Amino acid sequence: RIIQITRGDSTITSQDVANAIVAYGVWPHYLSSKDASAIDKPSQPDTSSNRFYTLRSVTWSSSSKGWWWKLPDALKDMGIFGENMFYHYLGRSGYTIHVQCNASKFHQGTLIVALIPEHQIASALHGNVNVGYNYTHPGETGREVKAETRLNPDLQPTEEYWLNFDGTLLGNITIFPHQFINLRSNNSATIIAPYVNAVPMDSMRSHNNWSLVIIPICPLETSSAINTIPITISISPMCAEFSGARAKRQ
Amino acid sequence: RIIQITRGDSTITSQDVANAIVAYGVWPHYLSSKDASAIDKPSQPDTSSNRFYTLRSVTWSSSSKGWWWKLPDALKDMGIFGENMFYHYLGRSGYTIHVQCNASKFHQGTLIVALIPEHQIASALHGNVNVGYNYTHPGETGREVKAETRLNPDLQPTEEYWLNFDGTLLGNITIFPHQFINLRSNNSATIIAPYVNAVPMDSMRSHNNWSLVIIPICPLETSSAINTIPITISISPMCAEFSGARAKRQ
Amino acid sequence: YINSENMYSVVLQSSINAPDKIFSIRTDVASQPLATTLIGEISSYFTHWTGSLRFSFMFCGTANTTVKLLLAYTPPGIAEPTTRKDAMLGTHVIWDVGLQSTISMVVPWISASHYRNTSPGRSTSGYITCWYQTRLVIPPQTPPTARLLCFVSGCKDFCLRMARDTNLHLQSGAIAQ
Amino acid sequence: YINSENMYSVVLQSSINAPDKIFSIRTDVASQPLATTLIGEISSYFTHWTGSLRFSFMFCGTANTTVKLLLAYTPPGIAEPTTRKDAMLGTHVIWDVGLQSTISMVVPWISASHYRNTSPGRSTSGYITCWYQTRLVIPPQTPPTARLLCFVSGCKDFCLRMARDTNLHLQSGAIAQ
Amino acid sequence: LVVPNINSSNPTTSNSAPALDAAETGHTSSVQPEDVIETRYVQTSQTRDEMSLESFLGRSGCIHESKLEVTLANYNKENFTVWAINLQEMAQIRRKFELFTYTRFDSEITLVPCISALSQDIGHITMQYMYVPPGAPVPNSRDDYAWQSGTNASVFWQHGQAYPRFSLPFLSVASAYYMFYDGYDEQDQNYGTANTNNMGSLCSRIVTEKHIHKVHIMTRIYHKAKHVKAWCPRPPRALEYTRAHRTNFKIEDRSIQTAIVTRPIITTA
Amino acid sequence: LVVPNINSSNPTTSNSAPALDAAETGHTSSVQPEDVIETRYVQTSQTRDEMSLESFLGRSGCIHESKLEVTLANYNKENFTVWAINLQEMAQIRRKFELFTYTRFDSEITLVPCISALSQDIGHITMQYMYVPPGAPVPNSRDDYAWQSGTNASVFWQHGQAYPRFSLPFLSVASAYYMFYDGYDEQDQNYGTANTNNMGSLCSRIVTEKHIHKVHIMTRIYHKAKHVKAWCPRPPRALEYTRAHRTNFKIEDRSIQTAIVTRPIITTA
Amino acid sequence: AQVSRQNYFNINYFKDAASNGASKL
Amino acid sequence: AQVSRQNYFNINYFKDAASNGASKL
Ligand SMILES: CCCCCCCCCCCC(=O)O
Ligand SMILES: CCCCCCCCCCCC(=O)O
Structure with missing residues (x-):
């Protein structure tokens, strides 16, 4: 039940885990010379970039339908990791995602926490439309399912969370690395994920590798006055490597 | 006469050197655990920070009296090195300074290029005055001897370049690591300098370790129409290490 | 207080649903409020100090009350953080208050010099x-607030x-016989 | 100057077509102008000295400018030379300024006593x-003058x-706190 | 005495949380830097000798200032002083020893006699300092027979002489000195260390016979502990002392004032 | 420490010109007498010990002159002095140490106390000199409780006593003293060594109680470095000093004056 | 006898132990 | 111990090294 994960100068503790999941059974590791493409020495900032970064908390209420964040986008503003991300053409990283949500023994609810590779979102409308860059790059704020009028909507992604935002049934989302946070049992979910791509390193600004999706499968219910509780996400890059240094991209 | 120094993804060549000087006979190296004070792992960005950064060129004319820059201040805005400098409380670095100045066999002039440790500048005025932080932190622009009215002058450093800006005679400046660029013989000066301080790492924002002073000891003279020539400085951090990460200091 | x-406890609130700052203190062993603790008092009989400090916290709410807190140490050279984002960019521990009511966090020695003065001037070791x-x-039907206790001692x-x-x-003045 | x-360089002239004297200096380490050099300054913290002095010169004219100079050391016991003939009768070096811009000449220790006073009275070690x-x-189309730099240091x-x-x-006076 | 080295540390992902404990147990946490952060290997080189009790208490500090105002009128009748020895009258020393419940040590006493001239000259002044253990006759005048010092220890100082100094062995009838005593008289009186700490008196007189120069002699007494041992540490005194042998701290018409300094808001360091 | 011998030398006619070099390189020439002249074989016999740092800096020089003018009116209120210790206030010593960027050494302090009689007699005078490290309470009066010296080091001198002396170990929190410091406060203020060189104060008081003789006491403090090490030599100070901890040299309504003496013509030595 | 130090000479000159200097740690 | 000189007797009498005389070169 007790976890303690130490990353840089950061340590996470959780007295109520469903022990951690290692996506696809592979622990993150630095890129091997046998798989490498680019020929310059990759810079490895170590503890200055491989540490836990806590994002802006979201509120879980009885009418919440879901949220998603994309990596590495969510960390583009995070200290040294964010800096390296934009000073270099190529980057590569694994992550430890720790989703935290505590309540009480008098609260009930269940979240599905999934990490999806190449989560190519569907657009909201019909016709010849596609999702605009800005909308799949919300930053640490992430995206929350709101079912109610946004803009240049021919550029917006779909809000059909029950179709995994991409035309497949929620429900089968379990085929992806995931954990459930069932309030009567745990107060956190931890997923360790390696780098997954069809190329050894890639552009972090242009390609998001993982999408983190959180969906309340069973609603938050309680008789307590504290009837909304936050969900906080802390993500730690792991084995971050960068290559192709030049000016910082704006 | 021919040099080629390769640092990160940067290479310097000079077909007319007075071969390089290694300040105090010590080659730069990472901080040893035997001398260390701070107890966290220092981040070492490697090729992303240990590369040549070229500063804004200055013009050498017949009325030039001198210039100076301070390290690490001069590089505070330089890529990944500048970033690390402000995200961390402590830093440590050696440098390769390559001063370049070409002319023609029909030009004559001589520069003294000195690297001074703890160059504590004197203030311009008499009385109870001291040098203001902004004036010893000019950035890549450096400071040029101009003998003519500046501001809040009770905060300004002295312009007595012939007194090394500190009350000692130019002329004895040779006691410091230095090289001469005598136009009839060379077109560059190269000084490799290790970290020198009474503590193992230090605050880069608050303490400048080296001061780079350039002074025309023999004036630029020529019958050519090209009667002013630039002096360009390229500095490469070496074995840069940082420790004590937190938010970026503004 | x-x-x-009451000067020894901080009150946490269930009515706060935000990433608010609960309290902060300088890390200098002989600065206030650390000055009158055992370690601060002994340090005040010396001029220089070095080493790591261990800070421990004890949650004193109900066995049914829960919370997760962010305890962070900000190395010097910068102003104390005013937002959770800036605080977490430093050394920190995320504390899950569940069945164990206590946690220990270590403030490591991160200083230019090997020792620091116990009487700091315009200086800090951080926050x-x-x-x-x-x-x-x-x-x-549970009290809506809960207290937190903070302890300090030095490491090896x-x-x-x-x-x-x-x-x-x-x-x-004179001490009467 | x-x-x-400018007090640190001498100007040579192409208009001079004669065996003229360019400059001269006493050889006593702590006499003027040597007094404020590194070696002259350290010597002024002592009373006696001995040894040979190394004098080096750097020609700073154009790469196309040339000249040959006579650098001479006149042992004591006689007035400083006023003609090239009298100067060359002593210890000297004929310097051809071509591709190397520098030369070193050594003023050997030639003294009756093993040591000399750093503060000389009516005395000299020569010129x-x-x-x-x-x-x-x-x-x-080349500048008609060129500068010369002179350095000094001690030998083994x-x-x-x-x-x-x-x-x-x-x-x-007092030094303000 | 060496401080341990800071060892290298790596990123851990485990079931054992060294940072998590229960302070309810009354035990101090065992977490070191390596348990909470990815630590760098540093070779620490600090001795802890200066922090030893011998070093801390083994320093001379003032414990008494004895003022003798020489009267020329009743020269033999007065001109002597008596002081019941104790370490409770001067704050700096008292606070250091009270950091422990029981202490045991030998004592080094150094005297600093200063003659204040109140006449044109000071002549030749000689002083006698006698240690009077409990029970021995205490002098009643400058010419008391007790000054013969047939068996008590006396030390003499004359103008011009270096500072007198001598050692005393651990003096108690018990195995250690009581810095605190939660007890009484056999008569249910005098709560405190007044019962336990009866070391006798230090008496002094000006030895020189009647003369014509008014002078005051102030002898400050310095005490240094040697070969020290101590037991049961206590929190340091937080308020000014008011009396010897009592932990009383209340002062009339004055509020309790500790060394804690207040701040407006606790969210600003 | 031996100086090398001058070897015999002969007439050379060669392709290698040892006299010819390039000083552009920043390297000092290696030419010795034998390279430029037909040298005689001399057996030199000079030690270089006296030129060592230990010898050069290991000499006692004045660093402070502390004047205490004893006032009889407010005897306990005043009559004490405070001085923030430093090696910047007296030129001879300051210039020698500033020949290096960083220095490290132990210190020997010798005191020379002189009583100036302003009355018919001087009576018996005793002084106390206390070292107050940064943070310890600084005395506010002659009778301040801080003079109890419970743990600070104090030294006493009385008229008639030889010159006091004691050693201090290397005091910095860094590995060496900063003779120069190109840096600031954590507040971007106080450029210079004022930041780095905070060694506390030396405080003194006349210990003798109120008396009737006016006197002034001037205690000169001498400092000698022992077991010396130094790094990064610098050119010697060329102008008068004006302030402590600052390299400032400008004086009001006065031109810059170095030790260089001018001559009329450079063709006459 | 001789002792090392953080080498020096040291012997006791008096017959009572209370007379001795500071204790060795 | 005894040392040569530019022979003499010398031993340290105090327990702290700062107390020692000038260093041997
Ligand atoms: C004769 C000179 C004075 C000797 C003083 C040493 C006695 C210390 C007794 C400690 C007990 C106490 O007062 O709390
Ligand atoms: C208590 C007597 C005085 C001891 C003086 C030694 C301190 C030297 C500190 C050197 C730093 C400086 O002032 O530049």
Whole structure:
């Protein structure tokens, strides 16, 4: 039940885990010379970039339908990791995602926490439309399912969370690395994920590798006055490597 | 006469050197655990920070009296090195300074290029005055001897370049690591300098370790129409290490 | 809360649903409020110090009350953090208050010089700040606030030198026989 | 040229077609102008000295400018030379300024006693004089003058004894705190 | 005495949380830097000798200032002083020893006698300092027979002489000195260390016979502990002392004032 | 420490010109007497010990002159002095140490106390000199409780006593003293060594109680470095000093004056 | 006898132990 | 111990090294 994960100068503790999941059974590791493409020495900032970064908390209420964040986008503003991300053409990283949500023994609810590779979102409308860059790059704020009028909507992604935002049934989302946070049992979910791509390193600004999706499968219910509780996400890059240094991209 | 120094993804060549000087006979190296004070792992960005950064060129004319820059201040805005400098409380670095100045066999002039440790500048005025932080932190622009009215002058450093800006005679400046660029013989000066301080790492924002002073000891003279020539400085951090990460200091 | 037992605890609130700062303190062993603790008092009999400090916290709410807190240490050279984002960019621990009511966090020695003065001038070793990571949640019919206790001691690391008289005690007059 | 960088260089002239004297200086380490150099300053903290002095010169004219100079050392017991003939009768070096811009000449220790006083009275260790051996020649469209730099340091030979306070620095008043 | 080295540390992902404990147990946490952060290997080189009790208490500090105002009128009748020895009258020393419940050590006493001239000259002044253990006759005048010092220890100082000094062995009838005593008289009186700490008196007189120069002699007494041992540490005194042998701290018409300094808001360091 | 011998030398006619070099390189020439002249074989016999740093800096020089003018009116209120210790206030010593960027050494302090009689007699005078490290309470009066010296080091001198002396170990929190510091406060203020060189104060008081003789006491403090090490030599100070901890040299309504003496013509030595 | 130090000479000159200097740690 | 000189007797009498005389070169 007790976890303690130490990353840089950061340590996470959780007295109520469903022990951690290692996506696809592979622990993150630095890129091997046998798989490498680019020929310059990759810079490895170590503890200055491989540490836990806590994002802006979201509120879980009885009418919440879901949220998603994309990596590495969510960390583009995070200290040294964010800096390296934009000073270099190529980057590569694994992550430890720790989703935290505590309540009480008098609260009930269940979240599905999934990490999806190449989560190519569907657009909201019909016709010849596609999702605009800005909308799949919300930053640490992430995206929350709101079912109610946004803009240049021919550029917006779909809000059909029950179709995994991409035309497949929620429900089968379990085929992806995931954990459930069932309030009567745990107060956190931890997923360790390696780098997954069809190329050894890639552009972090242009390609998001993982999408983190959180969906309340069973609603938050309680008789307590504290009837909304936050969900906080802390993500730690792991084995971050960068290559192709030049000016910082704006 | 021919040099080629390769640092990160940067290479310097000079077909007319007075071969390089290694300040105090010590080659730069990472901080040893035997001398260390701070107890966290220092981040070492490697090729992303240990590369040549070229500063804004200055013009050498017949009325030039001198210039100076301070390290690490001069590089505070330089890529990944500048970033690390402000995200961390402590830093440590050696440098390769390559001063370049070409002319023609029909030009004559001589520069003294000195690297001074703890160059504590004197203030311009008499009385109870001291040098203001902004004036010893000019950035890549450096400071040029101009003998003519500046501001809040009770905060300004002295312009007595012939007194090394500190009350000692130019002329004895040779006691410091230095090289001469005598136009009839060379077109560059190269000084490799290790970290020198009474503590193992230090605050880069608050303490400048080296001061780079350039002074025309023999004036630029020529019958050519090209009667002013630039002096360009390229500095490469070496074995840069940082420790004590937190938010970026503004 | 000054001349009572209340100066020793902080009250957490379930009504706060935000990443608010709960408290902060300088990390200098002999600075206030650390000055009058055992380690601060002994440090005040010396001029220099070095080493790591261990800070421990004890949650004193109900067995049914929960919360996650962010305890962070900000190395020097910058102003103390005013937002959770800036605080977490430093050394920190995320504390899940569940069945164990206590946690220990270590403030490592991160200094240019090997020792620091116990009487700091315009100087600091940094700060420790506490923030709501999630929220103080309680079931029905449970007190809506809970207290937190903070302890300090030195690690194996810790060392003091150059004995001197303390500035934390006075004699302004004769002591009657 | 006194409070500037010009006190450190001598100007040679192409218009001079004669065996003229360019400059001269006493050889006594703590006499003027040697007194304020590194070696002159350290020597002024001692009473006696011995050893050989190394004098080096750097020609700073154009790469196309040439000249041959006569650098001579006149042992004591006689007035400093006023003609090239008298100068060359002593210890000397004929310097051809071509591709190397520098030369070093050594003033050997030639003294009756093993040591000399750093503060000389009616005494000298001799002189160093510089003369045109040929002429400063330049092609068309080249500056007609060129500068020369002179350096001094001691040889393996060099030694000082009997520490004393320096006459090269003063305190005429209090130093403000 | 060496401080341990800071060892290298790596990123851990485990079931054992060294940072998590229960302070309810009354035990201090065992977490070191390596348990909470990815630590760098540093070779610490600090001795802890200066922090030893011998070093801390083994320093001379003032414990008494004895003022003798020489009267020329009743020269033999007065001109002597008596002081019941104790370490409770001067704050700096008292606070250091009270950091422990029981202490045991030998004592080094150094005297600093200063003659204040109140006439044109001071002549020749000689002083006698006698240690009077409990029970021995205490002098009643400058010419008391007790000054013969047939068996008590006396030390003499004359103008011009260096500072007198001598050692005393651990003096108690018990195995250690009581810095605190939660007890009474056999008569249910005098709560405190007044019962336990009866070391006798230090008496002094000006030895020189009647003369014509008024002078005051102030002898300050310095005490240094040697070969020290101590037991049961206590929190340091937080308020000014008011009386010897009592932990009383209340002062009339004055509020309790500790060394804690207040701040406006606790969210700003 | 031996100086090398001058070897025999002969007439050379060669392709290698040892006299010819390039000083552009920043390297000092290696030419010795034998390279430029037909040298005689001399057996030099000079030690270089006196030129060592230990010898050069290991000499006692004045660093402070502390004047205490004893006032009889407010005897306990005043009559004490405070001085923030440093090596910047007296030129001879300051210039020698500033020949290096960083220095490290132990210190020997010798005191020379002189009583100036302003009355018919001087009576018996005793002084106390206390070292107050940064943070320890600084005395506010002659009778301040801080003079109890419970743990600070104090030294006493009385008229008639030889010159006091004691050693201090290397005091910095860094590995060496900063003779120069190109840096600031954590507040971007106080450029210079004022930041780095905070060694506390030396405080003194006349210990003798109120008396009737006016006197002034001037205690000169001498400092000698022992077991010396130094790094990064610098050119010697060329002008008068004006302030402590600052390299400032400008004086009001006065031109810059170095030790260089001018001559009329450079062709006459 | 001789002792090392953080080498020096040291012997006791008096017959009572209370007379001795500071204790060795 | 005994040392040669530019022979003499010398031993340290105090327990702290700062107390020692000038260093041997
Ligand atoms: C004769 C000179 C004075 C000797 C003083 C040493 C006695 C210390 C007794 C400690 C007990 C106490 O007062 O609390
Ligand atoms: C208590 C007597 C005085 C001891 C003086 C030694 C301190 C030297 C510190 C050197 C730093 C400086 O002032 O530049």
